[PDB]
A paper describes a structure:
Pol α-primase is a constitutive heterotetramer composed of a dimeric primase (PRIM1 and PRIM2 in H. sapiens [human], Pri1 and Pri2 in budding yeast) and a dimeric DNA polymerase (POLA1 and POLA2 in human, Pol1 and Pol12 in budding yeast). These interactions position the primase catalytic subunit PRIM1/Pri1 directly above the exit channel for lagging-strand template single-stranded DNA (ssDNA), revealing why priming occurs efficiently only on the lagging-strand template and elucidating a mechanism for Pol α-primase to overcome competition from RPA to initiate primer synthesis.
Fork-bound CMG was incubated with Pol α-primase and the replisome accessory factors Mrc1 and Tof1-Csm3. Although Ctf4 was not included in replisome reconstitutions, we identified a 3D class containing both Pol α-primase and Ctf4. Although we see no evidence for the presence of multiple copies of Pol α-primase in our dataset, density for Pol1CIP was observed on two Ctf4 monomers (the third monomer is bound to the Sld5 CIP box), suggesting mixed occupancy within our reconstructions. Thus, Pol1CIP can bind to either Ctf4 monomer while Pol α-primase is associated with CMG (labeled sites ei and eii in Figure 2A), presumably because the CIP box is linked to Pol1exo via ∼200 aa of largely unstructured polypeptide.
Author numbering:
A (entry chain D): 2 to 35, 48 to 201
B (entry chain A): 1 to 5, 44 to 177, 181 to 299
C (entry chain 5): 21 to 104, 131 to 198, 205 to 213, 235 to 303, 320 to 335, 348 to 415, 421 to 455, 460 to 524, ...
D (entry chain C): 1 to 105, 119 to 208
E (entry chain E): 1 to 58, 68 to 144, 158 to 193
F (entry chain 3): 18 to 55, 90 to 331, 338 to 448, 455 to 568
G (entry chain F): 75 to 104, 122 to 221
The structure:
């Protein structure tokens, strides 16, 4: 019935779909305030009451839908700037086991905004693309150290992103399950 | 990164022999047999008799070690995980306290023999075990600045000793070792045997001792504390007199030294 | 002094920054190589030129000096992307610059990057070169170390810690080494000027470029062209290499299985063999059995039972060539053989030696002989052992050895030697003018059913998957038939060595169907086809 | 021995599973092994005859307490292990057929019981798809909607065709700018590509 | 351990060495002679789905299990010296399934400690070859010929996961 | 320097813990001490590398990855153990300063370091490895100086000194000039005391990858191995062998100034630590075998049981099977007090029709005799079958190679007359003798001969004399103990029985 | 496991979907961009429900005999209708009969009476998954 590759996990398309439901801040280039939108899964007042160059908050999928056309501009999140990413890299280097406290959707949102909204950043984009890479590489080192503690009981993780978890899910759970089977078989 | 998370007598002797040697610090508990009491005491007594015999024959530490080490596996094992061996060792020492506290001559002979056995067993340790054992006994190193200021005198003091005791014939090797070596400062009266042989540097009433020496302080503390414990053991011998079944054994044990 | 640091800094910033679209291709490649314990990087010239032409200019002017600087830059990046120890990484290059023909290289090209191509003709064994090396000073007994790198060195003489004129020796007990190999490149055959034998070069490679090619292969090479010491003021040239260029699926066996259940498969395979040859039905049937073979067996008392088939043919030239093409392994020869070894083997001379003919060389496969009557005298007697025992044994001039001869023989000619074969047949002809006209029309066309590769793969699959056994009904049938023929001959020879041949034919017939058991259906066709006469 | 045929049959289940998993577009499950299954069922019938004969000997009194109990029990295990093999094989081919039924809602390789089974399951799917819950197309796409509008190019000359949104004329190698929600079915049928 | 699972169905058919504790009439077909009895202290090789029961049902049960060659001392020493280099595929195609079945049957403690370490040490290199994506074949192909049928599934489901993520990102 | 002492201590703990090695030391010592009062066993011990792993992993990996730093202290500790155990008093002058410590050897579980000559690679240098292959060359044995002793004439003092070379030690030292000192530090003239000095044996060999593993007709690859003391002469060319030792490099590699521009590489070797053969014949009996053999021998008809168990896949010919069994057992060889010799080994010949299992039955002996050589009668010459000259050196033939064994000759009727007459000595005097330009020597050849032939007319003709059917001289037939004639006589029940038999087979 | 169905939520959601569809039709028959947003929002809403129901039906396939045994147990702490929706009940019931008919005629018709049960717990292997 359901496809074989969706029995236990989410595909990256579903991960993008999940991230798209979050709110984001925009500057509209038109006034809607005095037809009306009449949505059923969100607030409707914000879109009906827009005024040009007045900041407002909407779901990300509608924000990208507007930015497709002239009608809108997207404000970048404050963590997505050179100063903050510098500090997070320094945190990563300083604490050789803890993960730095980046938001749960950082990879997905960065790789959406760099494609759909390359024109709306303040920093030069060719530097952000480097610092995002540095963060992902350091985190991958820390992941490879952690896979030596798979065990029969449990594990704790902190600040690991959704896409990063979903990348690893079928390996961690499978090896952990087999260690559990081997151990309990000796008890019985 | 990823992250997870009587019995008391047996634990006591495991703790007491984690260091592999003990100052024999604490009161035993629980029970053993009277046959065990006699046999264990006689075994330790045989080793100490041979130690005193070799010392009366003026044999060296190496010769005594060659003579005594084969006897541990038969009479009094050492460097062993066995609870029976550990209890045998501990109890036999405590029994011979009660045998040899009785007089000054017996106390001196027992302290001498037991301290020499202590020296032998300490020589059998690895340096890590020696360090852990010394640290467990709660036993002042000089500053690097003081070492630098006294470096000429300290090196003049230890250079011959480094050549003869540590086989460092090359002066280059002696200098490298001296650069890595630590020194201890204490009153000269505490190491007077090394003072009389001019093996330590003296300044303002303090003796400067390298870390590769100083085992005589450890063995002297063992001897002194054993002498004090024997004096205490002597003071409460009237309580031993309540079980008659032990006195013939102790008389027999002491007769071989009189 | 500072130039060595600026150059290293430049190549370090190259690896950390080269994007084409959205992927940092050299950072990703360098990380993915370390995970499989491959310490190298394959840079492409065109990307280096695109990034900054000045770097390529420096590299193009002085390659012997600048290649080591880029290699150490790679190591410095490799640590950042994987550590919060590693050897020095090997740089490898790809290029599209114009090829130089090997014959045109000359004094204008010494210490330049050169791209060329040819055929490898020889390969040395591996040998050890030093990279990190430790030194002991004989007088003072002081110690130090040195770092070699392999570009165009000797032990030093500045004594340290007087200390003497030449006091240094090597501690092999605390030093590091790498692999090195030599190769020979010969110019392309379709380039050589007429009437001249081809020219060739010698060349060197180390670490991951070693043990990558074999003799006889055509290759393309990128490397520094240089000279070494070995007339007046004259030296030998060579090349230092920096880069080189040169079972079934499920969907396959499904076709073979569909063929296996076809009710007319035997007819189909017979029809597919030498289709131009008219008639000769039973000849084609026998060749199918020869290609498929029986089943090998081994018993508890160690005796060993043969699997091969042997056939003789008395037009006939075409079939042996067809068998050579369709068979998975094949050898073709005429009766005199390729050397004084003949068909089987012989001893030759100065010390004596031995060499095998075209029975030993075809071991494991099929061999076909084009005129069996032209067999030499020694081979006439030696083929008895080669066919009955599947071995050849020699004890002559101090040589004492035994050779393997595990093969199926096809033979043709135009006596007692016929007894060695399982089946014998005589080729037949027909003289239809349309056939000759068709052949002639095809000849003019070049001058102006199952295909071979599919059939060869199917034969391979069947040989690997199945080895069938006689059912009890077949045993009663065969034994009854055997005693019947001997009784008929007695009242008027058949022998066990022919019963054991009929069994092999029966098994080979059951093998086409992939049936694990042989049946009376196969026994009937086996005895029907046994009419050699 | 009585398990050899089962050990041979199950290898075809493993084989067809790997062949199926390798290429999701190429589903044609192979010929049903009627002959091996018939041989297995004949073996079970032989074992039944043996147990019945043994029961006759038990009623005759032929050391039936120990001998008939052990021989009967051992025979019972040989039958059970054959039941397991047959059910495993049939269950695999059933899962493959169920997978095809959802997309489709030719026949020669299926056994006749399987040929009616597939028809029954198609009736069930259309019963669920009808009635209440009809507003969501349960047999539709499972990939989340990414864009409203797409550009699609015309791959096969199906001529003029009708669809719930309207009418299309599929002129070979023409290109449309159209909403995906309309042409999703035609992309699945294979008349169109997204470019 | 599901009923309809093909790998479990197929792993239960491996043979183990066995010895009898009673003589029994007519069961000689186990020894491939239907016309004869089985006799006490005879030794035979029987499939696990049968030997697992005849070793339990009574008292003295009918069959005793002999220590099989795939759990021999040589294999244990090979496992403990270098687990990553080891060719488990040649030792037995279904090793980690039979290991768990045997552990349940005899409640072994030390074998469980050996097998847990073996699995944990091989998972590391398996992840290394899973993570390594082309932007090589020989280096990967040499290790992936020494995997069990059990390990191949984990490798396949890991490689596809990494590859799908990579494809989505760079797109 | 201090680390050497701790490694000696740690190996002493191992030797005290695993006590089966003490018994080995002591048993060798008491055995040698017994027969010395009237052969001698070597001062060598083999340790299981698994015990050392379970005792201390840090010492195990040290032995296996840094052998130059771990093997010497371990070997020193073994010598102290053997020296502290009791030993015979008042040693002689040579025994007092022998310079002869005990030595180690290893077995079990090498893991990744089990290799072959093709795959030994520069990454493995200075590691402890195990290799497999075929011996191809062996050097002559040579003595080597390691210590010399000198007596000073005036003072009466005995002096000594030691020598080293790069293949004598795992660790590296300044080389020694091989000079003998003539004069004392104090000017006294010295004398050299041979017999108190110490020399050891040395031999180099070469090992090559097995031909079964050679790829694509490519050139095969090989390594040189160094052996000494006890390991000398335990192999010969053609042996399949497995060698254990340390893989090491040597020399200056051209960095000492040379014309090569240093393109040439360093030299390398394996220092032989232990050697084991490979079976590719002999077996060793367990106690249970002696019991079973003795019990079986008391059956009423053991000869029938054993004879019918030879080649059961061949129907019939009971008497030939019995004859082959008696051949495999053989008689008893006699040497009389005056040097005269009486033969013991039995020779058998069988001649018969085509297809009657002659070659098939002859093939069985080759796979049940402990030493057997096989040849066809026309594929062998008289000299090749007995002995031949080369360069002067004399080279053995097939009958000389199978000395105390059996030789099988098929197609005996095809052998020429010039070849047959070379065999007349070997089947009675059991020797080979050559008298050719520059050579005269006698060689031993004690084997039993079994052979098969075809009759003159292609099938045996009962209507002609046996001499007409068997074209061999009377002096040759006399040398075969049993001569068997066998034929394919057509009969219904015989045919049925044989055919059913081969079909069951 | 198979988690219990949200009975109330689904009723309210499906009613809302119907009303929104009719509203979109009415406005269409009556700026473009608001209609764009409404249409694609309804697509986003329908996709989630489609995926969710397909997953639940896939779970019902795998645990059919277990759910039937749970329902047949008179002492069960939860009834099958509490756990499943009405459509799911229909699917479970009729699919079990279809599968049962197929194996009953093909295989089990030939077995002796001791082995004819399909949901046997007492055999040498348990026939029920969970
Ligand atoms: N009981 C038997 N009697 C005779 N031949 C048998 C018997 N069993 C098997 N054979 C077959 O007989 C065939 C010929 O045997 P072989 O030993 O080569 O005969 P041979 O005496 O050497 N004949 P030849 O090679 O012509 O001198 C082989 O294929 C054997 O397998
Ligand atoms: Mg023959
Ligand atoms: Zn110096």
């Amino acid at each position: 019935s359901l496809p074989a590759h969706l029995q236990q996990t989410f595909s990256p398309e579903e991960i993008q779909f999940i991230v798209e439901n979050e709110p984001i801040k925009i500057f509209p280039r038109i006034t809607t305030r005095q037809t009306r939108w009449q949505l059923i899964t969100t607030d409707d007042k914000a879109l009906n009451n827009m005024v040009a160059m007045r900041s407002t908050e909407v779901v990300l999928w509608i924000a990208l839908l507007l930015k497709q056309q002239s009608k809108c501009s997207i404000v970048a999140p404050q963590w997505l700037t050179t100063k903050e990413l510098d500090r997070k890299i320094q945190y990563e280097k300083t604490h050789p086991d803890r993960f730095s406290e980046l938001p749960w959707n950082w990879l997905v949102l960065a790789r959406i905004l760099f494609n759909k909204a390359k024109d709306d950043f303040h920093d030069p984009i060719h530097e952000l693309r480097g610092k995002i890479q540095d963060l992902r590489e350091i985190r991958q080192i820390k992941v490879l150290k952690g896979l030596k503690y798979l065990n029969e009981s449990h594990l704790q993780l902190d600040n690991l992103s959704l896409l990063e978890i979903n990348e690893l899910r079928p390996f961690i759970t499978e090896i952990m399950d087999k260690l559990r089977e081997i151990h309990t078989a000796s008890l019985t | 990164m990823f992250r997870q998370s009587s019995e008391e007598e047996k634990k006591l002797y495991a703790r007491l022999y984690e260091s592999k040697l003990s100052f024999y610090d604490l009161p035993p508990q629980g029970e053993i047999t009277l046959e065990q009491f006699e046999i264990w005491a006689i075994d330790r007594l045989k080793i100490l008799l041979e130690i005193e015999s070799c010392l009366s024959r003026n044999k060296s530490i190496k010769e005594i070690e060659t003579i005594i080490k084969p006897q541990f596996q038969k009479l009094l094992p050492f460097n062993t995980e066995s609870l029976e061996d550990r209890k045998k060792d501990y109890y036999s020492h405590f029994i011979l306290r009660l045998c040899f506290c009785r007089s000054k001559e017996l106390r001196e002979k027992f302290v001498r023999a037991e301290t020499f056995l202590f020296k032998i067993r300490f020589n059998m340790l690895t340096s890590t075990d020696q360090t852990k054992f010394v640290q467990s006994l709660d036993l002042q190193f000089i500053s690097n600045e003081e070492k630098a200021e006294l470096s000429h005198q300290l090196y003049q003091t230890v250079s011959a000793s480094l050549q003869f005791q540590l086989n460092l014939n090359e002066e280059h090797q002696r200098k490298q070792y001296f650069q890595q070596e630590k020194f201890i400062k204490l009153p000269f009266e505490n190491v007077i045997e090394l003072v009389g042989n001019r093996l330590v540097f003296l300044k303002d009433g303090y003796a400067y001792l390298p870390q590769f020496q100083q085992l005589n302080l450890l063995s002297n503390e063992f001897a002194s504390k054993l002498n004090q414990e024997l004096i205490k053991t002597y003071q409460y011998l009237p309580r031993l007199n309540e079980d008659d079944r032990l006195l013939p054994i102790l008389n027999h044990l002491s007769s071989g030294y009189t | 002094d500072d130039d060595n640091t600026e150059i290293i800094k430049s190549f370090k910033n190259f690896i950390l920054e080269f994007r084409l679209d959205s992927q940092f291709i050299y950072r990703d490649q360098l990380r993915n190589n370390i995970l499989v314990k491959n310490y190298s990087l394959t840079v492409n010239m065109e990307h280096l030129i695109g990034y900054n032409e000045d770097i390529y200019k420096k590299l193009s002017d002085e390659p012997s000096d600048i290649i080591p600087l880029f290699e150490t830059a790679i190591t410095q990046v490799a640590k950042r992307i994987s550590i919060l120890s590693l050897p020095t990484f090997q740089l490898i290059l790809n290029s599209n610059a114009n090829q130089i023909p090997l014959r045109d290289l000359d004094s204008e090209h010494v210490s330049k990057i050169v791209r060329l191509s040819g055929i490898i003709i020889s390969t040395s064994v591996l040998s050890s070169r030093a990279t990190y090396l430790s030194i002991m000073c004989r007088n003072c007994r002081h110690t130090t170390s040195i770092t070699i790198n392999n570009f165009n060195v000797s032990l030093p003489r500045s004594c340290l810690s007087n200390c003497g004129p030449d006091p240094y020796i090597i501690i092999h007990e605390s030093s590091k080494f790498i692999d090195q190999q030599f190769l020979k490149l010969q110019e392309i055959p379709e380039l050589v000027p007429v009437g001249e034998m081809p020219r060739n070069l010698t060349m060197t490679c180390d670490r991951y470029l070693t043990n990558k090619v074999i003799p006889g292969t055509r290759v393309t090479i990128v490397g520094i062209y240089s000279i070494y010491n070995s007339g007046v003021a004259i030296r030998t040239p060579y090349i230092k290499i920096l880069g080189i260029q040169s079972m079934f699926t499920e969907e396959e066996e499904e076709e073979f299985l569909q063929l296996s259940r076809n009710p007319k498969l035997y007819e189909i395979l017979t029809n597919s063999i030498a289709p131009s040859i008219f008639g000769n039905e039973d000849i084609k049937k026998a060749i199918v059995c020869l290609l498929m073979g029986g089943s090998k067996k081994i018993l508890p008392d160690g005796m060993r039972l043969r699997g091969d088939i042997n056939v003789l043919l008395l037009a006939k030239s075409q079939l042996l060539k067809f068998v050579e093409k369709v068979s998975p392994i094949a050898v073709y020869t005429s009766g005199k053989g390729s050397s004084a070894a003949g068909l089987t083997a012989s001893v030759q001379r100065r010390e004596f030696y031995l060499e095998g003919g075209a029975m030993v060389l075809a071991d494991g496969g099929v061999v076909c002989i084009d005129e069996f009557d032209k067999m030499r005298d020694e081979d006439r007697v030696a083929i008895h052992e080669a066919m009955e025992q599947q071995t050849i044994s020699i004890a002559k001039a101090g040589i004492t050895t035994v050779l393997n001869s595990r093969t199926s023989v096809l033979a043709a000619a135009n006596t007692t030697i016929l007894s060695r074969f399982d089946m014998i047949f005589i080729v037949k002809d027909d003289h239809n003018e349309e056939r000759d006209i068709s052949i002639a029309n095809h000849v003019i066309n070049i001058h102006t059913e199952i295909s071979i590769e599919k059939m060869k793969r199917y034969i391979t699959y069947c040989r690997l998957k199945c080895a069938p056994r006689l059912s009890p009904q077949a045993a009663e049938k065969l034994s009854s038939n055997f005693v019947t023929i001997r009784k008929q001959l007695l009242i008027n020879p058949i022998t066990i060595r022919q019963l054991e041949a009929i069994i092999r034919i029966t098994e080979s017939l059951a093998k086409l169907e992939l049936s694990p058991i042989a049946q009376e259906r196969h026994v009937d066709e086996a005895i029907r086809l046994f009419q050699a006469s | 021995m009585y398990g050899d045929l089962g050990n041979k049959l199950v290898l075809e289940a493993k084989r067809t599973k790997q062949l199926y998993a390798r290429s999701n577009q190429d589903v044609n499950l192979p010929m049903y092994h009627e002959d091996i299954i018939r041989n297995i069922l004949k073996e079970v019938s032989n074992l039944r005859k043996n147990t019945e004969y043994l029961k006759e000997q038990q009623q005759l009194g032929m050391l039936d307490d120990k001998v008939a109990k052990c021989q009967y029990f051992v025979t019972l295990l040989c039958m059970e292990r054959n039941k397991r093999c047959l059910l495993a094989y049939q269950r695999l081919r059933t899962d493959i057929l169920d997978s095809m039924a959802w997309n489709n809602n030719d026949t020669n390789n299926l056994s006749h019981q399987e040929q009616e089974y597939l028809k029954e399951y198609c009736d069930l799917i259309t019963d669920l798809k009808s009635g209440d819950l009809v507003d969501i197309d349960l047999s539709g796409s499972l990939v989340p909607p990414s864009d409203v509008f797409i550009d699609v190019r015309v791959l096969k000359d199906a001529g003029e065709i009708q669809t719930e949104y309207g009418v299309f004329n599929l002129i070979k190698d023409s290109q449309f700018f159209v909403r995906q929600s309309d042409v999703e079915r035609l992309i699945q049928q294979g008349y169109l590509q997204k470019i | 351990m599901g009923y309809y699972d093909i790998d479990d169905v197929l792993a239960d058919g491996t043979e183990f060495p066995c010895k009898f504790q009673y003589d029994i009439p007519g069961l000689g077909y186990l020894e491939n002679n239907p016309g004869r009895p089985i006799t006490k202290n005879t030794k035979l090789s029987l499939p696990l789905w049968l030997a697992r029961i005849l070793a339990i049902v009574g008292p003295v049960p009918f069959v005793e299990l002999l220590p099989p060659d795939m759990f021999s001392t040589k294999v244990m020493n090979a496992i403990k010296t270098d687990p990553v280099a080891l060719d488990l595929h040649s030792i037995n195609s279904h090793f980690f399934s039979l290991a768990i079945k045997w552990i349940m049957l005899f409640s072994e403690k030390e074998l469980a400690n050996v097998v847990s370490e073996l699995l944990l040490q091989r998972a590391q290199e398996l992840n290394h070859h899973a993570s390594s994506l082309s932007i090589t074949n020989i280096a990967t192909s040499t290790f992936l010929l020494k995997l069990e049928e059990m390990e191949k599934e984990i490798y396949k489901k890991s490689h596809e996961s990494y590859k799908d993520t990579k494809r989505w990102m760079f797109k | 320097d201090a680390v050497f002492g701790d490694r000696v201590r740690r190996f002493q703990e191992f030797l005290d813990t695993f006590t089966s090695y003490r018994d080995s030391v002591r048993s060798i010592q008491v055995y040698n001490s017994n027969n010395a009062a009237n052969n001698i066993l070597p001062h060598r011990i083999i340790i299981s590398l698994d015990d050392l792993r379970e005792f201390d992993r840090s010492f195990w990996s040290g032995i296996l990855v840094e052998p130059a730093y771990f093997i010497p202290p371990a070997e020193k500790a073994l010598t102290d153990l053997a020296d502290s155990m009791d030993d015979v008093p008042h040693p002689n002058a040579s025994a007092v300063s022998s310079r002869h410590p005990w030595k180690l050897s290893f077995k079990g579980s090498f893991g990744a370091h089990a290799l072959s000559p093709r795959t030994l690679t520069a990454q493995h240098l200075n590691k402890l490895v195990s290799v497999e292959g075929i011996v191809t060359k062996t050097s002559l044995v040579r003595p080597k100086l390691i210590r010399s002793v000198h007596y000073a004439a005036k003072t009466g003092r005995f002096h000594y000194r030691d020598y080293t070379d790069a293949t004598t030690t795992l660790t590296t030292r300044i080389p020694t000039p091989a000079i003998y000192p003539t004069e004392d530090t104090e000017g006294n003239k010295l004398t050299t005391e041979y017999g108190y000095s110490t020399f050891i044996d040395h031999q180099r060999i070469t090992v090559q990858e097995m031909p079964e593993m050679a790829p694509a007709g490519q050139l095969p690859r090989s390594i040189d191995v160094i052996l000494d003391d006890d390991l000398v002469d335990k192999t010969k060319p053609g042996d399949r062998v497995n060698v254990v030792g340390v893989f090491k490099s040597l020399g200056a590699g051209g960095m000492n100034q040379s014309n090569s521009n240093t393109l040439i590489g360093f030299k390398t070797l394996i220092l032989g630590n232990t050697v084991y053969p490979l079976h590719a014949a002999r077996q060793m009996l367990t106690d249970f075998d002696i019991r079973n053999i003795n019990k079986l021998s008391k059956k009423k008809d053991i000869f029938d049981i054993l004879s019918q168990s030879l080649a059961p896949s061949i129907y019939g010919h009971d008497h030939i099977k019995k004859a082959i069994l008696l051949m495999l057992m053989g008689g008893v060889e006699k040497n009389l007090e005056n040097g005269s010799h009486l033969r013991g080994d039995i020779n058998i010949l069988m001649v018969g029709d085509p297809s009657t299992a002659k070659s098939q039955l002859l093939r069985f002996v080759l796979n049940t005799a402990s030493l057997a050589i096989a040849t066809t009668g026309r594929g062998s010459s008289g000299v090749g079958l007995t002995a031949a000259v080369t360069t002067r050196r004399l080279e053995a033939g097939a009958m000389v190679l199978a000395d105390r064994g059996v030789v099988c000759i098929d197609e005996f009727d095809k052998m020429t007359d010039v070849d047959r007459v070379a065999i007349h000595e070997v089947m009675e005097q059991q020797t080979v003798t050559i008298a050719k330009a520059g050579i005269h020597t006698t060689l031993n050849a004690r084997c039993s001969v079994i052979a098969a032939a075809n009759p003159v007319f292609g099938q045996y003709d009962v209507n002609r004399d046996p001499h007409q059917n068997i074209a061999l001289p009377d002096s040759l037939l006399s040398r075969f103990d049993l001569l068997f004639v066998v034929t394919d006589d057509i009969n219904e029940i015989r045919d049925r029985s044989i055919s059913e038999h081969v079909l069951r087979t | 496991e198979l988690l219990p169905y949200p009975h109330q939520l689904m009723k309210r959601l499906l009613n809302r979907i119907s009303m929104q569809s009719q509203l979109i039709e009415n406005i269409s028959m009556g700026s473009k961009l608001p209609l764009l947003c409404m249409e694609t929002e309804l697509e986003r809403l329908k996709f989630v429900i489609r995926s969710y129901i397909r997953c639940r039906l896939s779970k019902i396939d795998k645990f059919s005999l277990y759910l039937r045994q749970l329902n047949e147990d008179e002492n069960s702490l939860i009834s099958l209708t509490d756990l499943l929706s009405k459509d799911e009940i229909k699917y479970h019931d009729t699919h079990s009969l279809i599968w049962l008919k197929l194996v009953n005629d093909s295989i089990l018709k030939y077995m002796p009476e001791e082995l004819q049960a399909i949901n046997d717990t007492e055999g040498s292997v348990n026939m029920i998954d969970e």
